[model samples]
Target: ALHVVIVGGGFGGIAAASQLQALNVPFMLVDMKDSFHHNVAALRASVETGFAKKTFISYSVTFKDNFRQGLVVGIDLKNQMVLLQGGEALPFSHLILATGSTGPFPGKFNEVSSQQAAIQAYEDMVRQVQRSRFIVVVGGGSAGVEMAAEIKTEYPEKEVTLIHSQVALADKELLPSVRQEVKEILLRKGVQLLLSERVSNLEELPLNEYREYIKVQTDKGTEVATNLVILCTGIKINSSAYRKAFESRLASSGALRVNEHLQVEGHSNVYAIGDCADVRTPKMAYLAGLHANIAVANIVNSVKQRPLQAYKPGALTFLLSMGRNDGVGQISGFYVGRLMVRLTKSRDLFVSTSWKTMRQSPP
Candidate 1:
């Protein structure tokens, strides 16, 4: 029996392990944290709309039944045993890494299991943010734009502006046409969108009780003030091992080097998925899920002595939500507005998807 050892409980790791569980394949899942974090969704409205309980999905709550959880410090691939922080070791034949990233949340997730000591940390951040009158959300990407838009939409009385380094918003992830639509949405929501902007200084505002707010120095020597700042730039890729393992073959793009099959080159038993993997395509939750499917089938086939299917990420529709009722989405290279956005991800940011994945139906 192949003992499949999976590391991390992030989206990619969970997707791979869940598929194995559904097939009744044997595996052990290890995560460093004590529980799974719904932080990404938690930030959106879990604090803003007093919906913490609704966004509550703890790690112990989600994966306790499928496999045992443990704290892992290191992996001894040569011996096929994982090193745990508590000094325990487990042998394995295959492994999956799904460690996701975390961000600074201001009063973000206190309502979810305030039992943890760290819940107070989020509480402080929340208090700090809500008390502020002006907010500057840094980064023009999906999370940044949406966060800025939501704040602007929810409390128009409070000033909210999003600053981006590029000449436009959403950059490479969004098509040129889609970016124009985002600008329109920003305009309507009273969001000040600054393009080709850079922050030269982050000054402390005495009005915000000395909370250091970002003071940006724009192209024309214009300065802006905000009581709060949210950094939603891209996450730091966690692929140090892959970078060393396949240094020469890796892309100039600073991502994991994978073949057309999305398998990490040179190692069939070893594969990477999600934000860390260099799949020659955009790294989104949906695409990460697809990568897992392709990798799993290939792994299973290699073990079963059969051919596997190739992974091809073709054109797909993606939705960008401004808030509960406002959204922008596209399919077939056409930008669809409020109606289409509300129809898809606007109402729910894949909250339903997470619930269903846990085999729980929405109430």
Candidate 2:
């Protein structure tokens, strides 16, 4: 009578569900949306015509009866039930919380609950990008860097500017060599870089939607006129439901505190992974998949009365795709050139790999 419930159909949730299915475990995969948004290639889909169709894969194809579309409002820890939005509850012997973070458009969907709507959203973004003559990308993280590079690559005629508050591009944790490479690539691609400067009036700028023209100002008294402003900032972990269940178990970063087994602190039956967990590893899809493997293995071990395995953080690895053919990243403390990055990620953004993982052929 052991029923497992995995919440949030992001990479972690899907990976966990897939692992459970392969092991013949009875589990339910829950999410707010009806489909998995392949956000890794979202920037490409935003600019490339008709590419959105391949990005949103419906859960019905493979998950079938195991997929439940609903909004998780809270978790009833005492009763071991997941509280849905409409007064519905699901009993669970084991739970996996993988509610990942949310960001602006393209990187993450906005208010999209269905596959059709998500595709339409991507189409809208594509049209906006096509119509805009000047585009500005805010933030220096992977999302912003990729967005700026993608736009410039797609439309070399369009004026693209990337503004980062920090002096360096990408995360500061990245090696200086990697950062320098990214900066050089962006500059070579003809992207205007506004480094070491913060957006003075980001709140005033109408973000997401396309406009004819707008002026963006920086704290260092630099101004750039642009028509489309893509705000790639304000990423927050989706951990409200976990907090509602047990505020004491939450970390300062708003992620659930998990032990070595990836189980919620002091709770053996519940686990957290991906961006929602206070894992020291950088929040990326690859790490999320690793978390899923460890969590699912432990769950299986617990069910079989076997010794649980401790979750060890993986090596520092990341692949940053600039466009369809160019990228840069570090693998296991070694800096890889653009060829490795392109072959691994930049070409098709792993669309086929994700589809294959879902037990389906790419569209």
Candidate 3:
């Protein structure tokens, strides 16, 4: 009875399930939400009304009878079973843990178990953004940069300020010229950039919530009053259940340590991928798909008694969308211009591509 059980329904989990379906393998996909949230396009959905409906695609349309909506409370490694919240257990010959990371709203959905609730949350965010006169976005990473750009582009009259602790706007892996290009675009879009500064009192301020008025103070003793504050700082790996089952196997950052084959260390029957796995590459949705393919291939190979393939890290490439029509990025050690970025990602934000990957027709 060779059966696979996949936990989490994000990019990696859905990808593994889709691959297994294509291979005619029997597997159960478990997730808390009824729909898959298109995280790459979530920020856009939050800023634009009526776009949230397209971002959440129901699992029933994609996985049909193979999908189960429930919370995975724990993992029983000794018995090779997944423990659900209501005491039910699912037996599996192989396990794939793809529980991705979590962060602030609009970047990551907080409402679990209901697709309508998540869509409603996004609508609320859009209304809040519409009512706000001034907004302050924290962090200069892709999420922060994109959020600020979306808001400023939609409402040019609103004042938007972006604060970053580092002098650079994006990751250091990107070329300095590409980073400069991002800064220049933000400046051109009327976004105030405050570099080499940190929000000292982030703990004291109410984050990811709508407020009438709030004061933002920096470590350099500069202050700005804004109506709303959006924190796009970072994310934490969702690995609590894994840690409880195998504490020593997880890293200090709560990511599961895996071998070159993407198998969880010390457990050949279990595999980890995506944000939950300690892979030495940038965490992106596409990379998660690559990890899923490798893990699924290895799983099938192990069943067929064939040689396993080693997982290789991809190139350092990124296409950051500045609003919907402009951006900057680097590929193969060369920087790409706005037209390439727009044609590749800025237009439609890969919503149709995600639907196609899930084997469903786009709306």
Candidate 4:
């Protein structure tokens, strides 16, 4: 029997696998990590101790067969196999690459395999916030904005600062009102917001007890002293070096160029989605899950000799949380306020809903 091989176990990969399982398609899922990381909750988890434990979902919750835990290094298009760093090959009839992007330090996730360790990771992050007198957050994106707000709300007297090169928070992708509301939240919460200023360099000044503080100098000739610096800038694409096998198929942005059917340009049997795909959409989990649904359905259609469906564009829906009780967002092109955010995301970070989708309770 021909088997489908998935190179990731993230949001996109899990979505694809779940659909494939519903159809009873023989498939294999590969991931180096022990559990799936719920990245959206990372910012709030950092401020709220022990919150990280609920952000991870065990692989056993959904997938039960052919789940290989290993680091994938390359793809052998000619041999139809996945090359792992450990010198093992996973042969497959179809392949899907959903390996997401890697962010700087706290923007991503802390390294932890078990629930207890994950809990400690969040606790330590909160402890770091508690010990710092001044905190500098670099970036105005979703992660940066949310991180700044959470920190400021958790400790109102800590002197939190948020800096971004863009003129507006969340940029032009979101409505002006949304950005305005975010700015208002920051200003009301006592977070010092700096706009149109780029950091020229970061100098770490050492102190007693092996502790060091960062001196952030910007192009505007302004300097700030902070005991902790949290970088929430852009992310590094996590595509493997093995993509040289079909190097022409990759876009200049380091993401795999896929067709409307989500198939990689050169290889008919391979598809790429999520943060690794040049889909001209925000690298958000919900969008990635939508991509996975399309890709998996097309795979099933291929086996049945049916015509593949084209992906349709949709409205940009987003919810930006400013601390625990307030936020700004849009749902289906309609602007939503703080109440929608608090009840949906800010309350428990949607941990319960995410686990419920996977047919499991939080661990």
lDDT per residue as tens, model 1, 1-363: 587776666667777877887787777766654444444454554236344333444555555655555656666757767677677787776766554333334312222233343444444445655776877776787777787776776577877778888877774755677888887888888888887886545443232132556465555577887777766655656543334445665556556667766666776666667766776555577767777787677778878989877876666567778866688867756767888887677677677776677565443
lDDT of each: 0.64, 0.87, 0.88, 0.79
Off by more than 4 A, model 3: none
Any runs in candidate 4 off by more than 4 Å, and if so which?
Answer: 110-119, 203-213
Tell me the deviation in Å of residue 95 in model 4: 0.7
Better of 1 and 2 by TM-score: 2
Give the per-residue lDDT digits (tens) of candidate 2, residues 142-223. Answer: 7899999899989999999999998888877777899899999999999999998898998898876778778899999999
lDDT per residue for candidate 4 within 12-88, as digits (tens), equals 98888877887788998888776778888888777777677777877765787657777887888778888887898
The alpha-carbon lDDT assigned to residue 155 of candidate 2 equals: 96
RMSD of each: 3.8, 1.2, 1.4, 2.5
On lDDT, the leading prediction is 3
Tally clashing residue pairs in candidate 1.
5
User: What is the RMSD of candidate 1?
Assistant: 3.8
TM-score of 3: 0.96
How many Å off is the CA of 329 in candidate 3? 0.6
Better of 1 and 4 by lDDT: 4
* Model 1 CA deviation exceeding 4 Å by range: 46-49, 65-71, 100-126, 202-220, 240-254, 361-363
Residue 296 in candidate 1, Cα distance off native in Å: 2.6
